[PDB]
Write an enzyme that holds these catalytic residues in place. Structure first.
Site, PDB file in Angstrom:
ATOM      1  N   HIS A   1      19.985   5.951  29.081  1.00  0.00           N
ATOM      2  CA  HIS A   1      19.552   6.376  27.749  1.00  0.00           C
ATOM      3  C   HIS A   1      18.751   7.634  27.896  1.00  0.00           C
ATOM      4  O   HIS A   1      18.085   7.885  28.909  1.00  0.00           O
ATOM      5  CB  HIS A   1      18.620   5.359  27.104  1.00  0.00           C
ATOM      6  CG  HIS A   1      19.224   4.046  26.795  1.00  0.00           C
ATOM      7  ND1 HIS A   1      18.765   2.866  27.364  1.00  0.00           N
ATOM      8  CD2 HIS A   1      20.242   3.706  25.952  1.00  0.00           C
ATOM      9  CE1 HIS A   1      19.501   1.851  26.916  1.00  0.00           C
ATOM     10  NE2 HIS A   1      20.409   2.337  26.071  1.00  0.00           N
ATOM     11  N   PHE A   2      18.839   8.461  26.862  1.00  0.00           N
ATOM     12  CA  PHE A   2      18.034   9.683  26.769  1.00  0.00           C
ATOM     13  C   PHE A   2      16.857   9.338  25.915  1.00  0.00           C
ATOM     14  O   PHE A   2      17.050   9.002  24.674  1.00  0.00           O
ATOM     15  CB  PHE A   2      18.851  10.852  26.142  1.00  0.00           C
ATOM     16  CG  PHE A   2      18.154  12.161  26.264  1.00  0.00           C
ATOM     17  CD1 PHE A   2      17.216  12.602  25.286  1.00  0.00           C
ATOM     18  CD2 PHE A   2      18.438  12.982  27.375  1.00  0.00           C
ATOM     19  CE1 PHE A   2      16.548  13.817  25.441  1.00  0.00           C
ATOM     20  CE2 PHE A   2      17.786  14.179  27.567  1.00  0.00           C
ATOM     21  CZ  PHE A   2      16.872  14.624  26.573  1.00  0.00           C
ATOM     22  N   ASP A   3      15.628   9.349  26.483  1.00  0.00           N
ATOM     23  CA  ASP A   3      14.439   8.926  25.623  1.00  0.00           C
ATOM     24  C   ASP A   3      13.782  10.065  24.834  1.00  0.00           C
ATOM     25  O   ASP A   3      13.518   9.918  23.604  1.00  0.00           O
ATOM     26  CB  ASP A   3      13.410   8.298  26.562  1.00  0.00           C
ATOM     27  CG  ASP A   3      12.443   7.370  25.850  1.00  0.00           C
ATOM     28  OD1 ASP A   3      12.963   6.483  25.162  1.00  0.00           O
ATOM     29  OD2 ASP A   3      11.182   7.582  25.982  1.00  0.00           O
TER      30      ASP A   3
ATOM     31  N   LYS B   1      26.206  10.899  13.816  1.00  0.00           N
ATOM     32  CA  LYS B   1      25.051  10.534  14.578  1.00  0.00           C
ATOM     33  C   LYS B   1      23.855  11.474  14.213  1.00  0.00           C
ATOM     34  O   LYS B   1      24.070  12.697  14.235  1.00  0.00           O
ATOM     35  CB  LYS B   1      25.361  10.617  16.082  1.00  0.00           C
ATOM     36  CG  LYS B   1      24.217  10.070  16.912  1.00  0.00           C
ATOM     37  CD  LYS B   1      24.571  10.076  18.434  1.00  0.00           C
ATOM     38  CE  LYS B   1      23.597   9.340  19.205  1.00  0.00           C
ATOM     39  NZ  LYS B   1      22.603  10.117  19.952  1.00  0.00           N
TER      40      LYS B   1
ATOM     41  N   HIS C   1      25.363  12.827  26.437  1.00  0.00           N
ATOM     42  CA  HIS C   1      24.229  13.716  26.788  1.00  0.00           C
ATOM     43  C   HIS C   1      24.510  14.754  27.826  1.00  0.00           C
ATOM     44  O   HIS C   1      23.664  15.526  28.148  1.00  0.00           O
ATOM     45  CB  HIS C   1      23.037  12.846  27.245  1.00  0.00           C
ATOM     46  CG  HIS C   1      22.565  11.916  26.172  1.00  0.00           C
ATOM     47  ND1 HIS C   1      22.140  12.392  24.921  1.00  0.00           N
ATOM     48  CD2 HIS C   1      22.599  10.563  26.059  1.00  0.00           C
ATOM     49  CE1 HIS C   1      21.795  11.368  24.163  1.00  0.00           C
ATOM     50  NE2 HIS C   1      22.067  10.240  24.843  1.00  0.00           N
TER      51      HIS C   1
HETATM   52 CL   LIG Z   1      19.200  12.095  22.018  1.00  0.00          CL
END
Ligand SMILES: [Cl-]
Ligand SMILES: [Cl-]
Ligand SMILES: [Cl-]
Ligand SMILES: [Cl-]
EC number: 4.6.1.18
Lengths: 124, 124
Positions: free
Chosen positions: B119-121, B41, B12
Site C-alpha cells: 500500500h502507498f500510505d 478513483k 503506484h
Molecule cells: Cl495514493
C-alpha cells in the site's frame, strides 16, 4: 467538546517557527499539543505558516480528498511543514517520533461558515 | 483476484518516465492503469523510480502508518512522484484529474515473503 476548526488548529498549526529546528521537534510538539494523552497518535503534520495562510487554502484549488469527499483544497504554493510519525522505539506512554521537515503543498478538508480547515488530508 | 503486490505495482509504479511531462499525465495514467473503470478513483500517487528502488523502501526507515499499523516504511531519499487527484470538473465516466509532480519521500506498507510494498500510505 472541541469544535472541528479548533481541533484542526491544535493538531496542525505551528506558526511560531519557520521550520522544525531539531530531531526532537515532534516528540516535544506531539506532547504539548496533547496528542499523546492516552495513546500515541501515530502520524501528524504541523504547518509552519500563518493561520490566515492556511485558512486561505479553503478558497484555493478544489480537489478530491482521499476518502472521495469533494471539500478538499490544495494550496497553490508549497508551505513549510513537519511530518511526525512514530518510530519502532515508540511505546506509550513513552511515545517517540521521527521528525521530517519539508516544503510541500498542503491538502485540507474545509467546512462551515466561516469555511475553514477541519482536517489535514495530505501533503504533496 | 490480483495479489496485493501486483495491485501496488499497477496503481503506484511508473518507472518509464522521470516525471510527469504534461498536465494530462494523470488523466492518461488513471485510465490506462484501470483506475477509472467503474468509478473515478479519487486520489492516486505514481512513483517514477525503478521497481527495485521502491521495493527497497521495505528495508529502510520503519514508521507508523496513518492507520496505526507498524509495517510502514519511509524512503531515505526523496523520489520523483506524481499525485493525481480528481478536479471539480470530474464526473464519471468523464473523470478528470489534476497532475502535481513533486520530489518527496514515500511511505509504503510492506507485507509478505518477499517483503514488498502493498500500500502507498503518503509522501513527505
Ligand atoms: Cl495514493
Ligand atoms: Cl488540548
Ligand atoms: Cl496529519
Ligand atoms: Cl488491470
Amino acid at each position: 467538546k472541541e469544535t472541528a476548526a479548533a481541533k484542526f488548529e491544535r493538531q496542525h498549526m505551528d506558526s511560531s517557527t519557520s521550520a522544525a529546528s531539531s530531531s526532537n521537534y515532534c516528540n516535544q510538539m506531539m506532547k504539548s499539543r496533547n496528542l499523546t494523552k492516552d495513546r500515541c497518535k501515530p502520524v501528524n503534520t504541523f504547518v509552519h505558516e500563518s493561520l490566515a495562510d492556511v485558512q486561505a487554502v479553503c478558497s484555493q484549488k478544489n480537489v478530491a480528498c482521499k476518502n472521495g469527499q469533494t471539500n478538499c483544497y490544495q494550496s497553490y504554493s508549497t508551505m513549510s511543514i513537519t511530518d511526525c510519525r512514530e518510530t519502532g522505539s515508540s511505546k506509550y506512554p513513552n511515545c517517540a517520533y521521527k521528525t521530517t521537515q519539508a516544503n510541500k503543498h498542503i491538502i485540507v478538508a474545509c467546512e462551515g461558515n466561516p469555511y475553514v480547515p477541519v482536517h489535514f488530508d495530505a501533503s504533496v
